[PDB]
Structure formats: C-alpha cells, structure tokens
Design a protein around this motif. Structure first.
Motif, PDB file in Angstrom:
ATOM      1  N   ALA A 157      -0.838 -43.612   2.816  1.00  0.00           N
ATOM      2  CA  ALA A 157      -1.354 -42.890   3.972  1.00  0.00           C
ATOM      3  C   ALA A 157      -1.446 -43.800   5.188  1.00  0.00           C
ATOM      4  O   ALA A 157      -1.139 -43.380   6.309  1.00  0.00           O
ATOM      5  N   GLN A 158      -1.872 -45.049   4.987  1.00  0.00           N
ATOM      6  CA  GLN A 158      -1.858 -46.019   6.076  1.00  0.00           C
ATOM      7  C   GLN A 158      -0.450 -46.247   6.610  1.00  0.00           C
ATOM      8  O   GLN A 158      -0.251 -46.302   7.828  1.00  0.00           O
ATOM      9  N   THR A 159       0.531 -46.387   5.717  1.00  0.00           N
ATOM     10  CA  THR A 159       1.906 -46.627   6.146  1.00  0.00           C
ATOM     11  C   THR A 159       2.464 -45.442   6.923  1.00  0.00           C
ATOM     12  O   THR A 159       3.128 -45.623   7.951  1.00  0.00           O
ATOM     13  N   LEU A 160       2.197 -44.223   6.459  1.00  0.00           N
ATOM     14  CA  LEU A 160       2.824 -43.036   7.027  1.00  0.00           C
ATOM     15  C   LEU A 160       2.103 -42.489   8.252  1.00  0.00           C
ATOM     16  O   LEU A 160       2.763 -41.949   9.146  1.00  0.00           O
ATOM     17  N   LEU A 161       0.779 -42.612   8.323  1.00  0.00           N
ATOM     18  CA  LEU A 161       0.003 -42.015   9.399  1.00  0.00           C
ATOM     19  C   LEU A 161      -0.471 -43.024  10.437  1.00  0.00           C
ATOM     20  O   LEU A 161      -1.089 -42.620  11.428  1.00  0.00           O
ATOM     21  N   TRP A 162      -0.203 -44.315  10.236  1.00  0.00           N
ATOM     22  CA  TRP A 162      -0.478 -45.364  11.224  1.00  0.00           C
ATOM     23  C   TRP A 162      -1.970 -45.437  11.559  1.00  0.00           C
ATOM     24  O   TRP A 162      -2.386 -45.270  12.706  1.00  0.00           O
ATOM     25  N   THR A 163      -2.778 -45.699  10.531  1.00  0.00           N
ATOM     26  CA  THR A 163      -4.226 -45.699  10.716  1.00  0.00           C
ATOM     27  C   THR A 163      -4.713 -46.945  11.454  1.00  0.00           C
ATOM     28  O   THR A 163      -5.559 -46.844  12.351  1.00  0.00           O
ATOM     29  N   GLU A 164      -4.197 -48.122  11.096  1.00  0.00           N
ATOM     30  CA  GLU A 164      -4.651 -49.347  11.748  1.00  0.00           C
ATOM     31  C   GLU A 164      -4.159 -49.427  13.187  1.00  0.00           C
ATOM     32  O   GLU A 164      -4.832 -50.014  14.045  1.00  0.00           O
ATOM     33  N   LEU A 165      -3.001 -48.831  13.475  1.00  0.00           N
ATOM     34  CA  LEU A 165      -2.553 -48.722  14.858  1.00  0.00           C
ATOM     35  C   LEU A 165      -3.525 -47.882  15.675  1.00  0.00           C
ATOM     36  O   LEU A 165      -3.845 -48.221  16.822  1.00  0.00           O
ATOM     37  N   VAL A 166      -4.020 -46.790  15.091  1.00  0.00           N
ATOM     38  CA  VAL A 166      -5.019 -45.972  15.767  1.00  0.00           C
ATOM     39  C   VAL A 166      -6.322 -46.746  15.933  1.00  0.00           C
ATOM     40  O   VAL A 166      -7.020 -46.593  16.941  1.00  0.00           O
ATOM     41  N   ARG A 167      -6.673 -47.589  14.959  1.00  0.00           N
ATOM     42  CA  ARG A 167      -7.871 -48.412  15.108  1.00  0.00           C
ATOM     43  C   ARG A 167      -7.741 -49.384  16.278  1.00  0.00           C
ATOM     44  O   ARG A 167      -8.688 -49.561  17.056  1.00  0.00           O
TER      45      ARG A 167
END
Ligand SMILES: CCCCCCCCCCCCCCCCCC(=O)OC[C@H](COP(=O)([O-])OCC(O)COP(=O)([O-])OC[C@@H](COC(=O)CCCCCCCCCCCCCCCCC)OC(=O)CCCCCCCCCCCCCCCCC)OC(=O)CCCCCCCCCCCCCCCCC
Ligand SMILES: CCCCCCCCCCCCCCCCC[C@@H](O)O[C@H](CO[C@H](O)CCCCCCCCCCCCCCC)COP(=O)(O)OCC[N+](C)(C)C
Ligand SMILES: CCCCCCCC/C=C\CCCCCCCC(=O)O[C@H](COC(=O)CCCCCCC/C=C/CCCCCCCC)COP(=O)(O)OCCN
Ligand SMILES: NC(=O)C1=CN([C@@H]2O[C@H](COP(=O)(O)OP(=O)(O)OC[C@H]3O[C@@H](n4cnc5c(N)ncnc54)[C@H](OP(=O)(O)O)[C@@H]3O)[C@@H](O)[C@H]2O)C=CC1
Ligand code: SF4
Ligand code: SF4
Ligand code: SF4
Ligand SMILES: [Zn+2]
Lengths: 63, 331, 115, 176, 144, 208, 156, 96
Positions: free
Chosen positions: D22-32
């Motif tokens: 989910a982190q790889t596909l939805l770009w969670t840390e980029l949003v952080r």
C-alpha cells in the motif's frame, strides 16, 4: 646496483630557481654578531646563510 | 628631475618609471594598448573620459593600486583640460572619430580639440606632447577627414613647437576596424571595391607596433620636435588584401566592381543611422585612396622596433570570423 | 668510491637514450598541441622553443640529474597531451609580456643598481 | 556504547507485506513529506526587514578599526608597535618620532583593510587601548584604494564612533 | 477570527496617519507594522519597537528623507544610523540613547556622516610621512 | 606538579618502551634507533632500504597490526647531508596505539613507494614529491597534486622564497593570464624574534 | 528640450529594471561562500530583493568572488568572466578576494581578484558578515542606479 | 590647529603636505584629502596643570583599568612640571 660516480653535486637544474638568481647572487655564511644592547649569547650559536641586499624603493601610493 | 619622478624598481607593475601620462582618448582601440603598455612598467596614467565609467572599467586591471586615475572632461571646456594635464609631464593625444556626429564634426575632433589640448599643455608646463595624425593627411585632400587632420597637425605644431607628431598608416589589430571591416561585409554577399581594388595600395601596421613606438618616443629624448611615420613592412593591393582576409576567415569571396559615385551613394545612405555607421562616404573614399609614401620622415625602425608582417597576426585577428597562401606584396 | 643509488640509469648512455626518447615524443606532440590549443604560434618556432629548453640543461654530467629532468619532462608531456594545461600555461614558455632585459654593462648601469 | 542505525528486519507476515505494498502503490510517505511542507508554509517566516531591521550583535563584535583618544583629547597611541608585531597578516605599518613637545607619537599608522583578517589581536595587544575594532561593518567601497587606511582615516573613525566604542568597552572590559 | 485579522489590518491603516502615510511607509520600507515610538533622531530617523515580535523584528528604524546633502526618499542605507542608535538598533544594549545618553566629548563628531564611497567626499589614501632624504641645492652664484 | 602542569602516564611510557624494544629486536637489519617522548609517543628510526619491510611488519604482525596510515609527510632540514626526512604515522585500532617511523633521503636518492602496503599513501607521496621533490620509486602515477601546472621548484623546501618567483596577472594585449617575476608593493617584513638567554636548560648542547 | 527628457525617463526605466533584478553567479572559492549562503538563508532572504539564488553564468548579471583566488584557478575565473553578457558587474567579497588577505605573501595566491577582472564593489571582512554582504549588494544597486547610458549617447 | 599649505592643501598633524611640484596631488582632484581636524598636541596643551602637595604622584589616565599603565612621576624639579609619559597630563608642586 651502484654507479659509484665521482663528481661534485649540482642540483641547480632541478630547484626551479631562475637563472639570474643563481649566477648573480652572492650569499654570506657567518655567525651573527651579538646584539650589544644585551649580554645574552644564545643568538650566536648557529651559522646563517643570507643573500645580498637589493634595491628597496618607495611605493608611490601610501609610501 | 623632481625626485618623486626618479625611476625605481625593475620596470614592473609595482615599479616607478618617472612618467606621468595623460592619455586623451584612452577608451578607444589604440588607447587601451597605450594604457596597458604605460601601466605594465609602473607609470601613472591619468585617464579623461566623457563616456560612462562602465566603458572605462576595462582599464582598471592595467596598473597597480592608485596608478590609474580617471577624470571627467569635455573638449568644449578648457578648465577640464587644465585640471587633467595639470600634474602630468607627458600628454598623449588619441582623440578621433571615423564619422561625424551631430555635436562633433571633424573640425571639432581633429582641429579645435587638439589645438586646445596643446595650448593648455603648453600653459601647464608639460614637458612632452605626442599627437597622432593620419599618414595621408594633406591640405588638398578630398576627404574632410585628412584635411582636418592636416589643419590640426599644423595648429598643434604651432601651439606646441616641441610636440612629437606620429603618422600611423591604417592600424590593424584585434579590435581594429580595418581587418574587421573587410570581414564584416561578407554579410552583403558580394564585396564591392572601386575599380575592383586594383588601383589602391595599402600599408597596414600592427597595433602593438604603434603602441611600442609611442612608448619609445616618450622614452627617446631627441624625438622632441620630430615627426614619425609608422608603416608596416609590406604593401598590398586592395583586391588581394581583401582576398587574403577572406581566405583566413574561411569565407567565400566574390568581388564585383562598383562605380565610385555608386559607392558614395551607399555610404550616404548608411550615414543616416543614429548608431555608429558600418561605413561613411568619407570612409569609402578614404579606404580607396592609396597610402602615401614619405621616405624623408623618420620611420618606426628609428625607434628600435621591427615592424611585424600582417601574416603573423591575421590568424589572431580573424579566427573569430570562422565557424596559408600569403597575399603577394608590391615594393 | 662515492657509490650512489640509481634512479633509472647506470651511466650517461642510458640517460642519453632516455633523453632522446623523450625528445622524440615532444617533437611528435608539438604539431598536435599547437592545433588543439588554437595557438597563434607556428610549429617551427614551437620546436625551436623545445630545442632551447632542451639545450638549457645540456651541461649536466650526472645520470641521476639527467633522468630526473627526464621524469619532469615526461610529467610536462603528460599535462599537455591530456589537456590539463590551458593556453596560458603553454604560452608561459615564450614570455611575450615581459620587456627585454638588456645584457650590456652600460644599459644595466643606466637602468638601476642590479648587476 | 554504540547504537545500530540500520539493523532492523522487516516483518514478513501478510499484514506487513500488504502495508508495504500500500505504501508503494499509494505513495504514503510522499504525502507525509507534502504534509510537512504544507504545515511548514503556514508558519511565520524568519526574514527580517533589512536595512530597516538589523541582525543582533554583541559588545565583543569585531568591525571596522578605529584609533581612540583620552578625554582630554590627546590620542592614546604611544607607538609601542605591539599591534604591528602581533598582527598575523602584517596589515599594520607604523612610523614614529618625538613630537614637538617631546611626546612619543606616530607619524604613520596604516592598516590595509584588504590584508586584515579582523581577528582582534591588535586591540587586545594594545596596552593603552589606543586601537579598537569597532562595531561598524557597513563600509563597503567602490575602489581598492579607499580600503587602504592611514592615520587620519582611523582617527576620523574613532571620532565618529567613540560613543558606541566607549559604551561597548564599558560593557565588556570586565571580561578582559 | 477573520474579522479580527481584518480589524487589525484596518488598525494598521489608521495608525499610519491615514491612507497617504500608509502608502508612504508601504512603498518606502515595504512594511506596514505599527509600534511605539522609541526615539527621534537629530537627522530625522524614527525608531520603533514591538516586543511581541520575534527577536530581530522587535526593533526597526524609519529613515529620514533628507540627510546631510542628498535626497533619501528612496536611497536609504544602513550607514545613516548614528552610533548611539546603531548600538541600540543592533541589540548591543537594551537601553536607547534617550533614557541614558552616551558620554559627551569635545572631539566626537556632532554630525554623523554616511558612507561616502563613489562621491567627491570619498577617502583617498596618501603617505603621511615627510621626505626622508634631502637633496643638495647648488649655489646660484657663478663660480668663475 | 600542581594543576597547571600536564600529568604524566608512566604505564603507557613503559608499554611503548617495551614494544619499541620488541620491534627493534625483530627487525635489526633496518631499525637504527627507538625513542619514546616524555608525552608517550613512540618513534622508530630506520634505514631507507627498510621502508617496505618494517611498515609491512607493523601492518601484518599479530602483535602490532597497525592497519591504518594516519599521515605520511616530509620535513626539510638543510643542514643535514640527507636533506629530507620522511615521517610515517600509523594507528592500531586493535591495541589502540600509535607509532611513528622515520626515514631519510636527499634530492637524488629515491624512496620506495609504500602504495602496496597502504592505499592511503598514494596521494601523500604525490604531495611529498610536489612540495619537497622527493621521488618515490614504483608509484602508480607520480605527478604534481597541489601546485599549478608547469610550476617550477618545490615550495615547502626551506630555500624556496615565501612569495615564490613568479606572479600572475591578466594582460589585455595578449588577452590572457600571464606570469611575471614577483614584484611586491610592500615587502614582507622580517622579524628577528629569537631572544638570547636560552629558555630550556634541559636541551642545552655541548659547547664543542 | 523633450529630447533629453525622453532619454532621461527611458534611462531611469532601464536602470530600475537592471537593478531590481540582479542575477548572480557565485564562485564559492572558500569560507566567504558560507556567509554567501547565509545571505540566501531565511533570515536575510536575498531572493526577496530580486537577487536570484545560484543563477547560471549564461544569464548572470553580477559576479561575486567569495574566497581566495589561487594561481591555479585564475584562468578559469577569467574565462567565466569573459563568458558573461555585457551588462556585467563583479563584486569582490572578503579580504582574500580583495587583496590576498591572510595569504597575501604566498607563492600560489593572486594578490587580489582585481589583477584578473575589474571590480565594482569591494566588501571588507574575513569573512564579511551576511548583512555586510547584503549592504554591498544594495550599494551595487545604488551604483547601477547612478549610471546613465542614453544620456551619454545623446550628448555624444 | 589645522593650517593651510601655500599651494592650498590642508597640513596634517604629522606635517606632511605635497610640494608645489609634486605630481602626487593629482589623486586629490575631483576628490578631497582626509585630514583630522583635532590636533592632539594642542588639545593636550589646553589642559590645566594639576596641583598636588605630594613629592611623587601616580597617574593611570583616568578610568582605572580603562586608562594606561599606572606610572609614578617625580615633582622635585621646580623649574619644569612633571609630565605623564602616556597621557601627557602635567603635575606640579605648590610653589610659593
Ligand atoms: C483568506 C481570506 C482573506 C483573509 C485571510 O487570508 O486571513 C488569513 C488568516 C491566517 O492567519 P495567520 O496569518 O496565520 O495569522 C497571523 C496573524 O493574523 C497576524 O496578523 P497581522 O497583524 O499580520 O495582520 C495584518 C493584516 C494586514 O496585512 C496587509 O495589509 C498586507 C496583506 C494584504 C493582502 C492582500 O493581515 C490580515 O489580517 C489580512 C490578510 C490579507 C487578506 C487578503 O486567517 C485566515 O483567514 C485563515 C483562513 C483558513 C486558511 C486555511
Ligand atoms: C504597454 C506598452 C509597454 C511598452 C514597454 C514598457 C514595459 C512596461 C513599462 C512599465 C514598467 C513599470 C516601471 C515602474 C518602476 C518604478 C518603481 C518605483 O518603486 O521605484 C521608485 C523610484 O525609483 C526610480 O526613480 C523609478 C524610475 C522608473 C522609471 C520612471 C518612469 C518610466 C516610464 C516610461 C515608460 C515608457 C516606455 C516607452 C517605450 C515603449 C523607487 O524604487 P527603488 O529605488 O528601486 O527601491 C528602493 C528600495 N527601498 C525603498 C526598500 C529602500
Ligand atoms: C474492484 C474493481 C477495481 C479494479 C482494480 C483497481 C485497483 C487499483 C489498485 C492499484 C492502483 C494504484 C496505481 C497508482 C500508480 C502506482 C504506480 C507506482 O506505484 O509506482 C511507484 C513509483 O511511484 C513514484 O515514485 C511517483 C513519485 C513521483 C513524485 C510525485 C509526488 C506524489 C504526490 C503528488 C500528489 C499526487 C496527486 C494524484 C492525483 C492527481 C489528480 C489529477 C513504484 O516505484 P518504487 O516504489 O520506487 O518501486 C519500483 C521498484 N520495484
Ligand atoms: N587604423 C587606425 O585606427 C589609425 C587611427 N588613426 C588615429 O589614431 C587616433 C586614435 O585612434 P583609435 O583609438 O583607433 O580611434 P577610436 O575611435 O577607437 O577612439 C577615439 C577616442 O577618442 C575619444 N573621443 C572621440 N571623440 C571625442 C570627443 N568628441 N570628445 C572627447 N573624446 C572623444 C573616444 O572616447 P568615446 O568612446 O567616449 O567617444 C575615444 O576614447 C585617432 O586620432 C585616429 O585618428 C591613425 C591612423 C589609423
Ligand atoms: S584585527 Fe588582526 S589582522 Fe586586523 S589589523 Fe588587528 S591584528 Fe592585524
Ligand atoms: S599597540 Fe596601541 S599604543 Fe601600541 S602602536 Fe598599536 S595602537 Fe599604538
Ligand atoms: S577572506 Fe577570510 S573568511 Fe573569507 S575565505 Fe579568506 S580567510 Fe576565510
Ligand atoms: Zn597619564
């Protein structure tokens, strides 16, 4: 393994010094005299090599 | 000799040469070379400028600290000339223009300004004065350029009897119009020379040679009231000279004869521009005319300088015009 | 006696062949160097400068000094062929900006105190 | 004692692998990171309104040099040449002679601002506090020549800045 | 809320002497803040403080429009601040020269001068020493 | 020795002395002298021929194992027949210790390159050659590293002048940076600071 | 007449345009560059004056020499100066760039960057403070404001 | 106590003035010459002589640690006055 060559050493061609600062200068080898203002003799222990004094002129700006 | 003006050092940047020179027109083509040669040996140069100081900034690294002093002036005022040459012992005149502006015509540039400079220098006690006039300067010259040059030469020699007159012959160099001027035309496709340039001979001289000649004339003591003619080693016809210029620049050369009256018309059309003109009627007429020959006048060799042939410096000047077979000389 | 350690050579013959080898390399390089740096000098006077530089060190009679000078010359060749130097570094060999220093006694007497 | 910075082992259960996917596909840390930047926009900037506002300084601050004088009006310098001797950059040139009243005063006191390193060794070597490095720093120049100070320029600087210089020396002389 | 920030903006507009003074300060200092007047300078500079601002922005100066000889409506610079207000403005002390003035001396400049570089009043270096070697003066009377 | 005096550490002095004797015993062919300073620093004086062996020993022996080369430099003493001295500083992490190895050479005698023993030595020897003119045998690529291209002479040598022999400027006539003999506007001021009345009696030399 | 008025107004417009956006390329030679980067830091914010951060040499307006100029580097600096569009200025920052400074008597140091390129503004200090460099940049702006090109072309 | 040179320049406290024939004055055209208007010799001459009833008097320049090193001046010679070697102040015993 040894040349055993007999000739005086000469490194002038390797030091990079300009030619007119080799054949024209005159060095002096001496033991500096004691400063008569003081009686200490610690400054008269070694030998010194120094070159001859050349022209020193006044700067047009600030002198 | 005013001890503060006694030469000292080894003739370098921080030496003293005993020369205080005021170089009028130092912001021009020969002026930069003259100032550089003066400053590289430890002399103090006073530079008078009518232009924005930004244009004179290129003369700053030419001397030591405090050795180049910039002052404002104008030719219509005698107070500025007095304050600029007041403390100098050498005055050099290089004021010139190849075209006539609205506020300064050839009488203003080559006659009234040099005469005022010479008169003020004489009243100020300047020891040496050097004036520059063209080689082809004569009173009956068709072009007002050389006519005013001759009148100014007469009036300077009258105002400053001990002045040294130097008559260069169409100086060429890196920021010279003559080598550059011929190269520039290529843009109009063909090159137009009156009579195909077959009836005009030229005697080009290197810029460094002229600057060194001026320096040596400053140094030479017996050249007080003399008149020198600075000329190159080789004489060329105009046609093969332009051919060689185009050959070095690797530019195809096409020469087509143009009527003298037709050439004059083009110059007049050009003369219209507010900005400096590519060519003028006086310039076209002046270029066509063959350089005189004055064997009686002492030359550059009398100043201990060997004139440099144009073949050595042609590549230096014309390498920038790009993206071997020297021209034949007549003697 | 005075036994000394070799650097590269044992006698003046090996030193001379090294000097000759070095000289040939410089000769080949000058036409190329002149063209690549867009120098305004000719190949002839460049090679005359090479000759003058080599003749400056012609009084050396010691194999160690000779082959050390050969090493320094090889270092210079390296800097030029690899274009580590610039136009100014090459033109520093000709001294086109320095005024000519006179040699005769009277001129030196007139200019200053320097002998 | 020592710590390990990168000696963690990611878990290989299904929930952890799904979280990493989910982190790889939805770009969670980029949003952080975007959120950090967005939050950091809505805070007050640190810019001051120069030249109307000035950066803080200290009484110890080393600025332009100045020569001081006594309250009577005579200059404090006695031509001892200790500042010249201590100068790490040889920026000081001094010449002296007996004054007409027999006083020991300088005839030449030059400091090259373009050789000075602004270390302050000269002002701390001075026995009588004749030379100080004042609080001025806004003395930029259009030519190299005006940055070659003589005795008159330094005395003028002292007369110009004496009030602030004396106040700073009063504030800091108990630490020296 | 938003009404309060608008009210403070309107208060800033009203506190600068109207819209004319507001535009004046906005185009001269690129700032419209209002603070208590700390002091007035003999050259025309005004000094303000506001302790509610963070360190660095809690003190500022509004420059005069005409110092010694030049028009300074636009061409302001940091060299126009006199030494006492220079010490106060750079946070070298907490005391303005109004509450406690500096010591008065007869040699201290009574008229502060700004940086005069690129100006006929600029500093020109020169040697301050006398001639070292004196030359021999030949006699004026003929010897024969 | 009250608080202003640096405290001593005799344990480290004894350890360094014992280890110096040990290294001296193992390599008598090259080791010429061993010294321990009063601030507990061990320096070993060896023959030039023993650069590769001794260093290798100090890197590879189980007891010493100085695997890190901290610094390699040269010192110029013109009064000596062998003009230059080469100094190697090595650190042992296993035993938490430091050692120093000194060698001598003159202008013409090469010193064996120690690049094989330590990779760090390659730049260090380049700088030594640049600043002192000491040639290193079998160096991968020996050339100047800090001085300008075409620079003549070695700056670090005692005889070389502080300001050098040439200075650079820009010339508009040739439109390039050119080099001319140095001409200082203000000559550097030479100070005679050494006083009479010697400071340290413990270092007094015999009067010969 | 109106001829001088129009050129005066156009000259004022051109000077304002040139001095209200100065794009510097910076030679970060030594320790002076660190204060350079503190003048771009949030406290001083060079960008708020129209002075862009780290412009390219092909479209730069002012050259800032921040640090010691060695003999090995001088030709590169001269070439970079030569590669600049004509309305160009040079700001000498710090004592090393001004006169050689603390390496003045060195065999490998250019005794001032003005031996190589002409200098418009000299900023004193070692290193000069960020505020001091800002003062120098502002001073350069006033110097540009004082210049007049169309007027000189008109009277010539 | 600033005077004026015969040519027109201000004479400095040191006394250096360019001579009439000196070219180096050209640096001052269109500019000014930096001269300090306060001459220390006159300013210290204006100071009154202190009267002390002591044979030896100490001086540190005033200010304590903000002055010069403390020195002692002898006042036995009635012909002249004792002068401080640093500050230039003058002291005298109460004659008559
Ligand atoms: C948005 C709608 C307009 C109102 C607005 O922007 O206010 C933002 C204001 C933001 O608060 P803040 O700037 O963090 O608080 C600082 C103090 O108010 C600091 O207050 P201050 O003393 O700096 O106030 C000075 C005043 C006056 O400032 C000026 O005159 C210069 C600005 C003119 C802007 C045009 O500025 C304003 O309050 C008005 C801002 C410009 C509105 C357009 O409140 C909100 O509107 C929040 C809206 C939700 C955002 C998500
Ligand atoms: C539609 C046709 C377009 C044709 C081409 C023209 C392009 C657009 C023209 C409009 C440009 C706007 C120019 C306005 C600039 C003035 C800004 C003003 O604030 O400057 C003040 C005044 O300075 C100058 O005096 C302003 C001179 C600008 C020119 C004046 C009138 C020019 C108009 C002529 C336009 C006609 C064009 C004809 C050719 C087509 C002081 O500012 P400054 O000192 O910097 O900053 C100081 C910083 N402080 C305050 C923090 C200390
Ligand atoms: C039930 C029926 C449904 C049918 C199935 C549909 C289900 C969909 C599930 C999957 C959808 C996800 C697809 C979205 C794109 C994913 C691509 C991706 O993950 O690639 C990343 C790469 O992604 C990036 O790195 C892009 C970052 C670029 C910077 C941009 C900043 C991101 C934040 C900006 C906001 C985005 C706004 C998006 C909306 C825009 C609206 C117009 C992988 O790279 P690495 O992690 O390095 O691993 C590769 C080595 N094996
Ligand atoms: N091949 C050649 O060029 C040779 C040149 N001639 C003579 O040599 C002299 C100098 O030659 P050159 O340097 O190449 O010419 P330039 O055009 O390059 O320089 C002319 C100089 O005179 C100044 N000047 C011109 N007009 C005026 C004026 N009305 N008032 C004040 N200053 C003025 C210019 O200043 P500004 O830029 O501000 O206008 C400029 O510095 C000239 O007298 C020319 O006649 C001799 C034979 C040929
Ligand atoms: S601050 Fe340091 S470098 Fe500058 S003059 Fe004083 S002692 Fe010399
Ligand atoms: S140390 Fe002080 S008193 Fe001594 S020469 Fe320097 S400034 Fe003058
Ligand atoms: S001028 Fe001073 S701060 Fe700047 S690089 Fe040189 S030594 Fe460092
Ligand atoms: Zn006293």
């Amino acid at each position: 393994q040894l040349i055993a060559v007999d000739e005086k050493l000469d490194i002038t061609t390797l030091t990079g010094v300009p030619e007119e600062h080799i054949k024209t200068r005159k060095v002096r080898i001496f033991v500096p005299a004691r400063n008569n203002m003081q009686s200490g003799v610690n400054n008269t222990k070694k030998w010194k090599m120094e070159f001859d004094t050349r022209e020193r002129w006044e700067n047009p700006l600030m002198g | 000799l005013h001890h503060a003006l006694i030469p000292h050092g080894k003739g370098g940047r921080s030496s003293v040469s005993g020369i205080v020179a005021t170089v009028f027109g130092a912001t021009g083509f020969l002026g930069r070379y003259v100032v550089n040669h003066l400053g590289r040996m430890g002399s103090q140069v006073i530079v008078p400028y009518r232009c924005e100081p930004y244009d004179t900034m290129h003369l700053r690294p030419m001397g030591d600290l405090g050795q180049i002093i910039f002052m404002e002036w104008n030719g219509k005022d005698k107070d500025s000339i007095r304050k600029v040459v007041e403390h100098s012992n050498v005055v050099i005149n290089l004021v010139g223009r190849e075209w006539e502006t609205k506020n300064f015509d050839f009488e203003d540039v080559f006659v009234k300004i040099p005469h005022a400079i010479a008169q003020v220098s004489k009243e100020a006690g300047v020891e040496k004065l050097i004036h520059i006039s063209h080689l082809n300067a004569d009173i009956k010259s068709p072009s007002r350029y050389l006519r005013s040059k001759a009148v100014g030469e007469k009036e300077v020699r009258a105002a400053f009897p001990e002045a040294t007159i130097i008559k260069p012959s169409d100086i060429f160099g890196r920021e010279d119009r003559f080598l550059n001027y011929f190269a520039s035309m290529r843009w109009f496709g063909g090159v137009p020379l009156i009579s195909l340039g077959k009836e005009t001979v030229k005697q080009p001289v290197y810029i460094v040679d002229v600057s060194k000649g001026i320096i040596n004339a400053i140094k030479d003591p017996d050249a007080k009231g003399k008149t020198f003619a600075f000329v190159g080693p080789n004489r060329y016809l105009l046609f093969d000279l332009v051919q060689y210029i185009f050959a070095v620049a690797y530019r195809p050369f096409l020469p087509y004869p143009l009527p003298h009256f037709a050439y004059r018309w083009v110059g007049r059309l050009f003369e219209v521009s507010p900005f400096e003109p590519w060519t003028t009627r006086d310039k076209v007429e002046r270029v066509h005319m063959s350089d005189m020959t004055l064997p009686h006048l002492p030359g550059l060799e009398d100043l201990g300088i060997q004139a440099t042939p144009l073949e050595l410096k042609a590549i230096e000047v014309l390498r920038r015009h790009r993206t071997v077979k020297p021209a034949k000389t007549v003697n | 006696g005075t036994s000394v350690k070799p650097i590269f050579s044992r006698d003046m013959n090996e030193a001379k062949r090294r000097v000759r080898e070095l000289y040939r390399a410089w000769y080949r390089e000058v036409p190329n160097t002149v063209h690549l740096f867009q120098l305004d000098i000719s190949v002839k006077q460049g090679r005359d400068k090479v000759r003058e530089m080599f003749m400056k060190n012609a009084h050396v009679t010691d194999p160690r000094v000779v082959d050390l000078l050969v090493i320094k010359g090889k270092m210079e060749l390296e800097e030029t062929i690899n274009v580590w130097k610039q136009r100014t570094h090459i033109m520093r060999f000709f001294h086109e900006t320095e005024a000519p220093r006179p040699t005769d006694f009277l001129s030196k007497f007139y200019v200053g105190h320097d002998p | 004692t020592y710590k390990f910075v990168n000696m963690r082992e990611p878990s290989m259960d299904m929930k952890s692998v799904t979280d990493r996917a989910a982190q790889t596909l939805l770009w969670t840390e980029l949003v952080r990171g975007l959120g950090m930047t967005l939050s950091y926009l809505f805070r007050e900037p640190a810019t001051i309104n120069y030249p109307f506002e000035k950066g803080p300084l200290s009484p110890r601050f080393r600025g332009e040099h100045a020569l001081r004088r006594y309250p009577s009006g005579e200059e404090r310098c006695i031509a001892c040449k200790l500042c010249e001797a201590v100068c790490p950059a040889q920026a000081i040139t001094i010449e002296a002679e007996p004054r007409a009243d027999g006083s020991r005063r300088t005839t030449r006191y030059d400091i090259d601002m373009t050789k000075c390193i602004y270390c302050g060794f000269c002002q701390e070597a001075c026995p009588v506090d004749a030379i100080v490095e004042g609080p001025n720093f806004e003395f930029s120049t259009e030519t190299h020549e005006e940055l070659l100070y003589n005795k008159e320029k330094l005395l003028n600087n002292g007369d110009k800045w004496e009030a602030e210089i004396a106040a700073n020396i009063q504030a800091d002389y108990l630490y020296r | 809320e938003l009404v309060q920030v608008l009210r403070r903006g309107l208060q800033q507009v009203s506190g600068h002497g109207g819209l004319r003074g507001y535009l004046r300060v906005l185009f001269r200092a690129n700032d419209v803040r209002v603070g208590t007047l700390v002091g007035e300078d003999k050259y025309g500079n005004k000094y303000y403080e506001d302790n509610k601002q963070f360190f660095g922005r809690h003190r500022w100066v509004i420059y005069t429009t005409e110092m010694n000889g030049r028009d300074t409506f636009w061409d302001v610079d940091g060299s126009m601040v006199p030494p006492e207000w220079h010490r106060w403005l750079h946070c070298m002390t907490d005391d303005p020269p109004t509450t406690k003035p500096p010591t008065a001396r007869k040699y201290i400049w009574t008229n502060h001068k700004f940086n005069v570089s690129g100006t006929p009043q600029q500093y020109v270096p020169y040697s301050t020493t006398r001639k070292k070697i004196q030359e021999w003066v030949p006699p004026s009377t003929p010897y024969k | 020795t009250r608080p202003t005096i640096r405290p001593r550490n005799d344990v480290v002095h004894k350890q360094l002395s014992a280890f110096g004797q040990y290294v001296a015993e193992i390599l008598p062919k090259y080791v010429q002298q061993v010294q321990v300073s009063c601030f507990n620093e061990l320096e070993i004086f060896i023959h030039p021929d023993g650069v590769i062996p001794v260093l290798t020993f100090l890197r590879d022996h189980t007891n010493a194992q100085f695997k890190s080369l901290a610094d390699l430099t040269a010192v110029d003493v013109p009064t000596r027949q062998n003009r230059f001295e080469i100094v190697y500083n090595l650190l042992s992490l296993r035993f938490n210790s430091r050692i120093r190895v000194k060698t001598y050479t003159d202008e013409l005698t090469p010193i064996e390159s120690s690049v094989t023993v330590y990779k760090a030595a390659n730049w260090y020897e380049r700088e030594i050659w640049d600043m002192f003119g000491v040639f290193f045998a079998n160096h991968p690529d020996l050339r100047r590293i800090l001085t300008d291209y075409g620079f003549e002479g070695h700056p670090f040598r005692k005889d070389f002048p502080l300001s050098g022999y040439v200075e650079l400027r820009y010339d508009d006539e040739v439109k390039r940076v050119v080099a001319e003999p140095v001409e200082l506007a203000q000559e550097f001021r030479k100070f005679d600071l050494n006083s009479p009345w010697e400071a340290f009696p413990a270092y007094r030399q015999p009067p010969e | 007449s109106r001829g001088e008025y129009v050129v005066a107004k156009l000259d004022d417009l051109v000077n304002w345009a040139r001095r209200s956006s100065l794009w510097p390329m910076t030679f970060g030679l030594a320790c002076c560059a660190v204060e350079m980067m503190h003048m771009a830091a949030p406290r001083y914010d060079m960008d708020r004056f129209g002075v862009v951060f780290r412009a390219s040499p092909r479209q730069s307006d002012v050259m800032i020499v921040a640090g010691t100029l060695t003999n090995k580097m001088a030709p590169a600096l001269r070439k970079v100066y030569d590669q600049m569009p004509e309305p160009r200025y040079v700001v000498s920052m710090g004592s090393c760039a001004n006169g050689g400074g603390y390496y003045h008597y060195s065999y490998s140091v250019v005794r001032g960057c003005d031996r190589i390129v002409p200098v418009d503004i000299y900023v004193p200090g070692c290193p000069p403070t960020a505020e001091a460099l800002l003062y120098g940049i502002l001073q350069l702006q006033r110097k540009i404001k004082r210049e007049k090109r169309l007027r000189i072309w008109y009277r010539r | 106590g600033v005077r004026t040179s015969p040519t027109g320049e201000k004479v400095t406290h040191t006394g250096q003035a360019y001579d009439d024939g000196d070219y180096r004055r050209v640096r001052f055209s269109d500019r000014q010459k930096e001269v300090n208007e306060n001459f220390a010799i006159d300013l210290i001459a204006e100071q009154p002589v202190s009267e002390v009833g002591s044979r030896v008097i100490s001086c540190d320049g005033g200010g304590g640690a903000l002055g010069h090193p403390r020195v002692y001046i002898n006042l036995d010679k009635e012909t002249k006055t004792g002068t401080c070697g640093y500050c230039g102040l003058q002291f005298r015993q109460p004659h008559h």
